[PDB]
A paper describes a structure:
NALCN consists of a single polypeptide chain of 24 transmembrane helices (TM) that form four homologous functional repeats connected by intracellular linkers. NALCN is associated with several auxiliary subunits, including UNC80, UNC79, and FAM155A (Family with sequence similarity 155, member A). Together, they form a large protein complex termed the NALCN channelosome. In addition to its role in regulating neuronal excitability, NALCN is also important in many fundamental physiological processes, such as motor function, pain sensitivity and circadian rhythm.
Here, we report the cryo-EM structure of human NALCN in complex with FAM155A at an overall resolution of 3.1 Å. Three glycosylation sites (Asn210, Asn216, and Asn1064) were identified on NALCN and one glycosylation site (Asn217) on FAM155A. FAM155A sits above the pore domain of repeat IV of NALCN and forms extensive interactions with the ECLI, ECLIII, and ECLIV of NALCN. When the four VSDs are superimposed relative to An1 and CTC, all R4 residues are above the occluding residues on S2, reminiscent of up or depolarized states. Moreover, the S4-5I linker unexpectedly forms a flexible loop instead of a juxtamembrane helix as seen in the other three repeats of NALCN and other Nav/Cav structures. Notably, the unique structure of S4-5I and S5I results in a cavity that accommodates a lipid, which may contribute to the regulation of NALCN. We have assigned a total of ten lipid molecules in the structure. The key residues in the SF of NALCN responsible for the ion selectivity are E280/E554/K1115/E1389 (EEKE), distinct from DEKA in Nav channels and EEEE/EEDD in Cav channels. Surprisingly, although NALCN is supposed to conduct a “leak” current, the intracellular gate is closed, even more tightly than the closed Cav1.1. Notably, the lower gate is fully blocked by the III-IV linker.
Author numbering:
A (entry chain A): 31 to 94, 103 to 336, 373 to 617, 846 to 859, 872 to 1578, 1589 to 1602
B (entry chain B): 192 to 249, 259 to 382
Write the structure that this text describes.
């Protein structure tokens, strides 16, 4: 049974991995590095191929079309044969290794799939699996259309608001045909050619479009707004949060300020934050569907004391902490190292001997067979063996050092709370283990495909060998410089192939960033919930001073005015005054500067007095009314009362001092920093922001435990990094010097003009540069010489900003194998570790609103119950019959093709914004003329509706009201355009086309639900966004006083600095998106001799503050990026399951609701919205389809439905919502959909209806299809 | 007598603008043509590759005057490349509160001259160890970013004079003169 034996089946899956490893070594560069690879890969491919062809013939010829795996195997043996036929030519004189024929090796790596073969009956039936997969596929397709709408919207806007970024400042000596690196400014910069419309170059310089000076598109670069094709590409790269601030600064220099500030900030808020959270919500609802489907589918005797005692456990734990701090403490110190037999090695051998003795005592006292069965003891054996190897003289400080630093893992037994949290969040290893394995297998297959696609270019590096390709694909996955990886390929592969590689990188980046990262979020959230049976069990089992008091507690002041009275009644009159004087004080502080302080300017000091004069009266009144802390109504209730009296004290102390000079590192400088806390009292005064702060701090214990895990990860990689890298990672400034004995004298250094704008040199020309001393130095942003420097470098790497600079510098200056350190830390910390905060914040948010305790069935029911409350009957009037003309116009305007041709015409008009609508280019005249023709077509379509139905009925629909308004603006633009022919009429033409382009979100049903999801999420998140802005003000005011005079540096420049509160706010928004915050921090850390100190005045010196920058930046990035922004994810995840809906035979769907609306709107003709009970028996006969109550067979359901509505109002009449809520309760499995409180009330009502209908059917004798499926279940149970 | 200041002879001293007019004489004070703080006295007292002191005053080894004029010329050519880079640095009016590009090009000129002539200076009232001009440049000049191509410069500027805790200003004190306005 050659085929059938299980012993060959394991071999035939393991050897698939070897067939991937061989094709990862077929490359011209790895063959010229290692010639024997070309011979061993051929024989290793040949004898492998025999095994796969041997099963392929035997399974068809002896044991044997429709089986997908049989045709897959057949295609894969053909891939091996054509690979061998190519290789036996390429090794001969036939063809070389740099030929493009190697592209016939790109389908081979897909044999990675055979190695697994785990695709049959994984706990669930096929049909049940395909129901999950199709349901998630339609959700993903819906969000892809939604994304494409946004990408095209910002595309047509970018074309119209911005154009070509080609007006660089140039030294005038440049003639048209000689543009070179020496003709540019050194801090390379754009201008506006129009005066006052942007930046303009200083004397001795001028600006002109470098493309007209003979530069080509690949020399300028691909990023610009010249057409919708390039504009959609720049919109995508900007929406990825990768170099978006550089596009913003280029736009600020070339064009007006306001349009750049509006466009790029709103692009980030929508397309980066709010839209990506919808892809996260779709994958979370996919995990919710899975639980639905899983839930629905069903001497030696001292061993007794010495091993157990708290003394022995605490002694080993303190010896482990002592060993770890001793091991990490070996900082640089100097250039003297003697590591064959030295200090820090004797300690390590002594502690290694102690842990050997500990392990052997446990093994003796417990017995080896009883010891080895524990998972902790298996791990401690691995460390006891690995550190016994590490402390051998030839292996000390080698790659065995991981077994040394992993000793800190044992320390987790310190508190049961951290153990329980670890076991909770990582959960059953099977969920996270399969996802990290899938992530690795995907990345390995994709790097093998990119390798065989690009390795022969010979003008492109980074794809020449498998490790280079792997680093390139991993860099694209991690979101860092991914666009630079793509551009390096685009400018090397050539213009004929640039579109093909562009869509390849875009498709990989889409999947790797939208699906893979959201799967980690969904897995960690699914672990943080209870199991559905455990929450079911929990639910089942749980069942004159009185004048001052009157002054303090002052009284407050249809529906439109009631909402205003509610607002006015929000706080006491005194707290409204305190909100007002706090806000005017922050507005005064907005005008402060290092060159304009309140201490020297009475105009700003007026607000400083008013704040203290009002707040002293406030605190005195509240103290005289209710006391300090002696009663539950007193003023010092909690931290809010403590914060306000502290703010009052620092404010009063500053106002009575007003120090006329202030040194840069002084108590007066600290008091001026503490004065910037005033915006914080607005959180206390406004009760919605008190709620936001208390709901945020509900998670503090969980957030703290995640911080302890991340600090533990940073500490082991820092300890390893100090032991491996101290004194290395340092070299000469001169690229041509390889030894420290040669780092003397001076050399010519080449200055950075720009990393973009890739010009070629003329054959004899030098780059711009000057003469400089050569020295042996660390990099200025990370040095790896002590634990503090190592942990600071790892904290910066953890945020994924500059991590590529750290990677390349380790590879270059230490060695290639040390790449593993930085890649593993980025996977553990950035991919897994920071996702623990995302999970904890969203889980605690759902616990605050109580939905964490509900079953997925109950959550769906609650989201249906609100969706049916939001629902209304249709505004559409019935068709007229008094004349034939309005009757045929009603038919015509309702045809199912007419709706689609009108939707297509909106896209057809939107395409006229493909290129800038200026006034000088004659192509503007056809485009504007065509928009007039479209405008008349839409005037006619509005007329067809106005003659199909009454104008009074037409105007009830919001869509009709909006499309009428846009069409009125259209015909107004048409007459104005022909009257004036000016640039403002072309601008108004572009505006009305953009206004009409938004109409398609009212016509496509899934696009409407996704737009509503985002629009309501902006309303829901308002106080969270205001809370973040109050923190931006506190940090901006602190940054102006702390860094306002800092000398320009790596990133601190004219575009980014703290010279005013406005410039501080835009610099903080850069840091919120994360764009190079650490380069800026290292500029703000500057001290002598890089800056000029002053003895007693902070506005005189241009130095920074070292400890100030470390506290100011790290705190800002943690509280905003790791914590606050994750509430905006929770808000989108809340609203997506509410507003989005799909077809599902468990609930009342939007198809059922539309069918019910159409049938309601033929019984309620007069549109009163409330029907007499006499017509309910008629209404529930017309409901054919999935709502069908059959008159026959289902007579008891018919009588129930009639009697329920007749009982509800004791006859009379019935609203739309009462019939609709009867339909929902009569079409769900109430025994799992309802909560245990409302379930008893329903069942009691329905039992009363059973008794009454039984009484009526007795009395009338004595005198002489989801609804019916659910009725059958109920009748069967009762 | 005075520092070079302004004028070809009014300061009771001149510059060696020509090779041949100094075969003999008696008092050494002729200043250079670009590195104006250095006279022939401290130059011949220092180190010259072709020949040394005394054979100068005795014609026979005058070839050293042309060697100093050649060094003075190379020091000027390297200075031009710096001040054209500084001219093309468009943020020279705003990068610092106390610094000015005038101060920068003074202290960088003094640094280039102390690189080409490592000789001591004296009798100018104001003296300073020549290694201080590295710290003047790193304090008073712009942050110019080097071209990351082969070497990745991880945030360091083009001009720096110290690394890995090496000793500096170690009392070697090559006495230079304080040739700066502030
Ligand atoms: C349980 C694990 C506890 C680990 C505690 C770490 C202590 C490290 C001691 C090593 C040492 O003395 O460093 C020498 C070096 C000596 O520095 P040096 O020798 O370069 O002198 C110059 C110092 N600078 C440049 C900073 C001014 O000291 C350090 O920098 C250590 C930083 C102190 C600890 C930093 C934070 C630790 C947080 C750990 C969380 C717990
Ligand atoms: C772009 C194309 C669109 C992609 C659509 C998104 C596809 C979503 C992935 C589908 C996951 C189905 C897994 C169902 C298995 C199951 O029953 O257990 C859930 C499993 C885990 O189940 P488990 O067996 O580990 O345990 C679950 C609960 N107990 C312990 C009680 C059994 O979840 C996962 O494995 C999540 C990650 C799987 C990723 C591997 C396939 C990815 C496909 C990418 C496409
Ligand atoms: C894929 C099929 C690619 C076939 C094109 C090969 C033609 C050729 O000569 O190589 C083109 C060029 C060759 O580069 P090259 O031509 O600059 O370098 C060699 C120079 N000559 C031509 C003189 C030998 O390389 C490519 O990159 C082509 C492949 C990239 C495009 C493949 C993308 C398909 C993936 C889409 C999935 C969605
Ligand atoms: C983002 C843009 C999208 C639309 C945003 C408009 C939202 C309007 C307000 C939201 C809302 O529901 O209001 C109801 C609120 C709530 O009042 P309420 O308590 O009577 O009703 C509660 C509101 N819900 C249920 C939605 C939570 O009305 C107010 O009273 C708002 C107070 C006004 C603002 C006072 C503080 C602002 C001062 C700081 C400003 C400067 C700081 C920088
Ligand atoms: C970070 C932002 C910090 C904002 C300023 C801190 C004060 C906030 C405040 O007092 O909010 C009211 C909240 C109180 O909100 P509350 O809703 O509990 O207030 C009513 C309290 N009862 C029901 C008892 C009458 O103050 C808190 O104590 C919030 C929790 C602690 C926050 C600590 C932050 C430390 C930093
Ligand atoms: C909520 C969010 C809260 C997050 C809180 C973070 C606050 C950061 C505190 C920084 C403390 C710095 C104090 C200090 O430097 O002392 C002054 C002292 C005094 O400085 P100085 O002015 O005397 O020295 C002059 C400058 N030198 C010496 C370099 C020439 O600083 C030092 O000199 C010590 C050198 C090493 C300092 C330690 C390096 C940074 C270690 C950071 C640890 C990583 C943090 C990650 C947190 C994890 C959270 C998830
Ligand atoms: C078992 C692993 C042992 C194999 C060693 C792998 C790395 C050794 C590379 C040595 C030569 C380096 C070289 O020439 O490449 C240049 C390249 C780049 O150099 P450069 O061109 O940037 O300079 O070197 C590397 O990037 C190598 C570092 C390895 C990065 C991570 C590889 C992980 C492999 C898959 C793991 C996933 C599970
Ligand atoms: C041609 C230039 C570029 C176009 C390329 C598109 C790029 C991506 C942007 C497309 C955004 C969505 C376009 C989809 C077209 C909508 C078609 C449509 O509305 O048909 C209605 C179709 C058919 O449904 P319907 O039209 O019967 O629904 C009408 C809804 N009521 C009942 C309220 C009137 O809906 C889907
Ligand atoms: C929420 C916070 C939002 C805004 C806070 C902005 C953070 C910036 C941190 C700046 C720290 C640098 C101060 C500069 C300085 O002078 O350093 C030397 C300073 C003090 O100078 P000093 O102590 O040398 O002065 C000596 C004089 N006497 C005797 C009066 C002390 O070092 C420190 O101790 C740092 C002060 C830490 C407090 C930082 C303020 C935040 C406090 C949080 C309040 C909680 C509300 C929530
Ligand atoms: C091209 O670059 C050069 C370098 O600046 C610019 O030439 C400069 O032109 C201005 C205006 O003429 C000169 O200022 C004044 O010059 C006049 C005589 O030309 C003189 O009477 C004044 O005292 C004053 O110096 C400036 O000196 C001159 N630059 C040089 C080399 O001296 C030229 O104009 C640039 N092109 C542009 C865009 O202007
Ligand atoms: C500064 O840039 C110059 C280019 O002007 C570099 O000189 C090149 O060095 C490479 C060495 O890899 C040679 O192959 C090129 O031929 C050189 N170019 C020319 C025009 O000769 C130089 O290496 C750079 N130096 C520094 C210090 O950055
Ligand atoms: C300008 O370009 C021409 C070639 O088109 C070249 O011959 C000439 O030398 C160039 N002039 C300068 C100053 O570079
Ligand atoms: C005159 O000659 C003597 C010879 O020793 C020399 O030392 C002295 O410097 C000369 N005079 C002047 C003014 O230099």
């Amino acid at each position: 049974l050659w085929i059938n034996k299980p012993w060959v089946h394991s071999l035939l899956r393991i050897c698939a991995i070897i067939s991937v490893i061989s094709v990862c070594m077929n490359t011209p560069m790895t063959f010229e590095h290692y010639p024997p690879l070309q011979y061993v890969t051929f024989t290793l491919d040949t004898l492998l191929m025999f095994l796969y062809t041997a099963e392929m013939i035997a399974k068809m010829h002896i044991r044997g079309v429709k089986d997908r795996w049989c045709v897959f195997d057949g295609f894969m043996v053909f891939c091996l044969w054509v690979s061998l036929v190519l290789q036996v030519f390429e090794i001969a004189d036939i063809v070389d290794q740099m030929s493009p024929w190697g592209m016939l090796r790109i389908p081979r790596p897909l044999i990675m799939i055979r190695a697994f073969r785990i695709y049959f009956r994984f706990e669930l039936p096929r049909t049940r699996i395909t129901n999950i997969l199709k349901r998630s596929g339609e959700q993903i397709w819906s969000v892809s259309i939604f994304l494409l709408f946004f990408l095209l919207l910002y595309g047509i806007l970018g074309v119209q608001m911005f154009g070509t970024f080609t007006y660089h400042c140039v030294v005038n000596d440049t003639k048209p045909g000689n543009v070179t690196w020496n003709s540019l400014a050194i801090p390379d910069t754009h201008c506006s050619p129009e005066l006052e419309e942007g930046y303009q170059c200083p004397p001795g310089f001028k600006c002109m479009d470098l493309e007209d000076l003979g530069l080509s598109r690949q020399e300028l670069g691909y990023s610009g707004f010249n057409e919708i094709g390039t504009s959609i590409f720049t919109v995508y790269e900007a929406a990825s949060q990768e170099g978006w601030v550089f596009l913003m600064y280029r736009a600020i220099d070339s064009f007006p300020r306001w349009r750049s500030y509006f466009y790029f900030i709103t692009l980030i808020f929508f397309l980066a934050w709010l839209v990506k959270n919808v892809f996260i919500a779709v994958i979370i609802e996919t995990f919710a569907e899975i639980r639905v489907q899983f839930q629905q589918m069903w001497a030696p005797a001292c061993l007794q004391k010495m091993m157990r005692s708290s003394v022995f456990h605490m002694f080993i734990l303190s010896m482990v902490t002592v060993d770890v701090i001793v091991a990490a403490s070996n900082y640089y110190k100097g250039e003297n190292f003697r590591r064959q037999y030295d200090e820090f090695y004797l300690a390590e051998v002594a502690f290694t001997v102690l842990f050997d003795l500990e392990a052997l005592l446990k093994i003796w006292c417990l017995g080896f067979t009883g010891y080895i069965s524990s998972s902790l003891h298996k791990f401690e054996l691995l460390l006891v063996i690995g550190t016994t190897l590490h402390v051998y003289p030839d292996l000390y400080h080698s790659q065995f050092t991981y077994f040394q630093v992993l000793r800190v893992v044992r320390l987790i037994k310190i508190s049961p709370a951290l153990e329980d949290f670890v076991y909770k969040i990582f959960g059953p290893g099977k969920k996270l283990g399969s996802l990290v394995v899938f992530t690795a297998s995907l990345l390995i297959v994709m790097s093998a495909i990119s390798l065989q696609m690009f390795c022969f270019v010979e003008e492109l590096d980074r794809f020449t060998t498998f490790p280079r390709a792997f680093m390139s694909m991993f860099q694209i996955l991690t979101q860092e410089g991914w666009v630079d990886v793509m551009d390096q390929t685009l400018n090397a592969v050539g213009h004929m192939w640039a579109p093909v590689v562009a869509i390849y990188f875009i498709l990989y980046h889409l999947f790797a960033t939208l699906i893979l990262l959201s799967l980690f979020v969904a897995v960690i959230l699914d672990n943080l919930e209870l199991d559905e049976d455990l929450k079911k069990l929990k639910q089942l089992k749980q069942s004159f001073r009185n004048f001052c008091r009157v002054v303090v507690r002052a009284r407050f002041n249809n529906t439109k005015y009631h909402q205003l009275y509610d607002l006015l009644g929000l706080v006491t009159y005194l707290d409204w005054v305190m909100i007002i004087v706090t806000i005017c004080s922050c507005i005064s502080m907005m005008f402060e500067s290092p060159f304009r302080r309140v201490m020297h300017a009475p105009t700003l000091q007026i607000a400083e007095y008013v704040f203290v004069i009002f707040m002293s009266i406030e605190l005195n009144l509240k103290i005289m009314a209710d006391g300090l802390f002696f009663t539950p109504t007193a003023v010092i209730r909690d931290f809010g009362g403590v914060m306000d009296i502290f703010i009052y004290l620092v404010s009063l102390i500053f106002l009575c001092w007003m120090p006329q000079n202030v040194p840069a590192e002084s108590g007066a400088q600290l008091l001026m920093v503490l004065r910037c806390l005033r915006p914080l009292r607005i959180f206390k005064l406004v009760p919605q922001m008190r709620k936001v702060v208390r709901e945020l701090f509900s998670g503090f214990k969980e957030i703290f435990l995640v911080s302890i895990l991340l600090l533990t990860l940073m500490l082991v990689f820092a300890s390893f990094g100090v032991q491996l890298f101290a004194g290395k990672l340092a070299k000469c400034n001169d690229p041509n010097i390889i030894r420290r004995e040669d780092c003397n004298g001076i050399f010519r250094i080449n200055v950075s003009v720009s990393k973009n704008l890739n010009l070629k040199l003329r054959p004899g020309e030098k780059k711009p540069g000057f003469w400089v001393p050569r020295v042996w130095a660390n990099p200025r942003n990370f040095n790896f010489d002590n634990v503090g420097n190592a942990m600071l470098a790892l904290f910066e790497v953890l945020s994924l900003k500059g991590w590529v600079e750290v990677r390349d510098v380790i590879i270059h200056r230490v060695g290639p194998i040390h790449g593993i350190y930085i890649h593993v830390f980025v996977f553990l910390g950035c991919m897994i570790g920071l996702t623990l905060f995302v999970g904890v914040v969203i889980a605690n948010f759902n616990e605050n609103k109580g939905t964490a305790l509900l079953t997925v069935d109950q959550r769906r029911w609650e989201d249906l119950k609100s969706r049916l409350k939001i629902a209304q009957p249709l505004h559409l009037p019935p068709r007229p019959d008094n004349d034939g003309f309005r009757a045929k116009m009603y038919d015509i305007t309702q045809h199912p093709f007419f709706k689609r041709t009108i939707a297509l015409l909106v896209l057809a008009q939107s395409v006229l914004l493909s290129v800038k609508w200026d006034v000088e280019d004659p192509v503007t005249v056809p485009l504007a003329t065509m928009s007039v023709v479209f405008t008349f077509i839409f005037v006619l379509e509005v007329t067809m509706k106005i003659i199909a139905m009454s104008p009074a009925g037409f105007w009830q629909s919001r869509r009709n009201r909006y499309d009428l308004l846009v069409t009125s603006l259209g015909v107004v633009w048409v007459v104005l355009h022909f009257a004036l022919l000016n640039a403002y009429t072309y601008m108004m033409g572009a505006c009305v086309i953009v206004f009409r382009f938004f109409s398609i979100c009212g016509k496509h049903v899934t696009l409407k639900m996704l737009l509503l999801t985002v629009v309501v999420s902006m309303y829901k998140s308002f106080f969270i966004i205001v809370g973040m802005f109050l923190l931006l003000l506190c940090y901006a005011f602190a940054g102006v006083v702390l860094f306002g005079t800092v000398k320009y540096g790596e990133n601190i420049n004219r575009h980014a600095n703290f010279s005013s509160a406005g410039k501080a706010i835009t610099v903080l928004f850069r840091i919120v998106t994360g764009e190079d915050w650490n380069k800026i921090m290292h500029d703000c850390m500057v001290q002598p001799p890089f800056c000029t100190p002053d003895e007693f005045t902070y506005w005189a010196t241009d130095c920074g503050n070292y400890a100030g920058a470390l506290m100011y930046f790290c705190s800002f990035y943690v509280i905003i990026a790791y914590i606050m922004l994750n509430l905006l994810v929770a808000i989108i995840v809340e609203n997506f399951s509410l507003f989005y809906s799909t077809e599902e035979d468990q609930l009342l769907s939007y198809n059922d609701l539309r069918h019910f609306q159409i049938i309601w709107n033929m019984v309620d003709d007069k549109r009163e919205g409330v029907i007499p009970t006499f017509r309910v028996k008629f209404l529930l006969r017309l409901l054919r389809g999935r709502l069908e109550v059959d008159l026959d067979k289902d007579k008891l359901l018919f009588k129930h439905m009639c009697y329920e509505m007749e009982r509800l109002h004791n006859g009379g009449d019935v609203t739309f919502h009462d019939v609709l809520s009867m339909l929902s309760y009569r079409s769900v499995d109430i025994r799992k959909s309802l909560q245990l409180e409302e379930l008893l009330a329903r069942e009691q009502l329905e039992y009363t209806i059973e008794e009454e209908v039984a009484k009526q059917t007795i009395r009338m004798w004595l005198k002489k299809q989801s609804c019916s499926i659910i009725h059958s279940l109920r009748e069967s149970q009762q | 007598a005075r520092n070079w200041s302004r004028g070809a002879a009014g300061g009771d001293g001149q510059e060696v603008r020509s090779k041949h007019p100094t075969p003999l004489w008696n008092l050494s004070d002729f200043y250079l043509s670009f590195c104006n703080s250095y006279t022939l006295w401290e130059l011949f007292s220092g180190l010259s590759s072709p020949n040394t002191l005394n054979c100068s005053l005795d014609t026979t080894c005058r070839q050293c005057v042309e060697a100093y004029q050649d060094y003075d010329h190379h020091a000027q050519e390297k200075y031009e490349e710096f001040e054209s880079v500084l001219h093309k640095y468009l943020q020279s009016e705003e990068y610092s509160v106390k610094s000015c590009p005038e101060d920068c090009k003074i202290v960088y000129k003094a640094w280039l001259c102390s690189q080409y002539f490592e000789v001591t200076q004296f009798n100018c009232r104001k003296t300073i160890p020549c290694k201080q001009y590295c710290l003047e440049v790193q304090t008073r000049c712009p942050f110019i970013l080097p071209d990351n191509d082969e070497v990745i410069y991880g945030g360091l500027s083009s001009f720096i004079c110290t690394g890995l805790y090496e000793t500096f200003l170690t009392n070697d004190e090559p006495e230079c003169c304080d040739v700066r306005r502030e």
